[PDB]
Amino acid sequence: METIAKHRHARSSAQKVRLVADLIRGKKVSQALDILTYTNKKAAVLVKKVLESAIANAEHNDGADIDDLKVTKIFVDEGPSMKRIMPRAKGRADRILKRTSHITVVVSDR
Amino acid sequence: MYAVFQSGGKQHRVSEGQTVRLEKLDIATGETVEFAEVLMIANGEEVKIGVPFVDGGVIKAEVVAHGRGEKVKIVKFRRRKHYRKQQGHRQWFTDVKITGISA
C-alpha cells in the first residue's frame, strides 16, 4: 500500500545519499532501520527519520499493517544548489555550490 | 509451379495466388494483365527455354493498387566548400495477385 514520504531542501549531495538508498530496495522495513541505525553516515540519520514518518504516516492515515510491509520505490533527485564563494590566491574567487537533495520514499506491502 | 518473367526490366519469381510489388504501370485498378515474357516455368517436372518466352508460355495476374512507395531523404554535402542540398523522393509501385499459370 501507499503512504509515501519525502524530505526536501536537505543539505547534502544526492550522490552521497544515493549510496544508502542502494542498501535498501525491496527490503523488509524492520531490517532497514536495523541496517541504517548501525550504518555510519550523516545521511542514515537523515533518511531514517523520513522512513520512520512514512510508517507513522500510514497507520493513522491508512490501514497500517506494518509487520507485512516493504520498501518499493526509493529514489533521490537533486534540489537547488546555493551559490557561495571560497576565495583563493592571487585575488581570484571561486563559485562553490552547496548542493541539496530531495528525497522520496514509497513503502508498501507489495 | 513457380515461374519467372519480366515486368520493369528486372525479373521476378512467383507462384499462384501471392502478392507482388512491381513497377508502376498504366492500367485499370482491378482489371487484369498477361505476360509473354516468361523466362522459365517449374513444377514437380521442369520446363525451360533455349530462347526467351518459352513456346506458349503465359502468365495472368490481377492488378490491385497503384500506391506510392515509402519516402527517402536524399542529401548532397561537401565539407568546407559551402555546398549542401536536400531532396526527397517517393517511388510508384503496382501491387498485383496471380490468377493462374499455364505452359
Binding site: 546555493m82 551559490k83 557561495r84 564563494i85 576565495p87 592571487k90 585575488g91 581570484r92 574567487a93 571561486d94 563559485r95 | -
Partner: protein
C-alpha cells in the same frame, strides 16, 4: 507575509563576477610578468 528567509546567494554572485573581472582584467601580466623570467628563456628569439 510568509516569505522564505532571504537568499543572498546573488550577493556572493555579484562579488564573484566583480572579483573575477577585477583581477582577471587589471592583474594584467602578473602571471606573465612572473612568466616574464620564463618569458626571457622560454622564448628562443634565436
Amino acid at each position: 507575509m510568509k516569505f522564505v528567509k532571504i537568499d543572498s546567494s546573488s550577493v556572493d554572485m555579484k562579488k564573484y563576477k566583480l572579483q573575477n573581472n577585477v583581477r582577471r582584467s587589471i592583474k594584467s601580466s602578473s602571471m606573465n610578468y612572473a612568466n616574464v623570467a620564463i618569458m626571457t628563456d622560454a622564448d628562443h628569439d634565436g
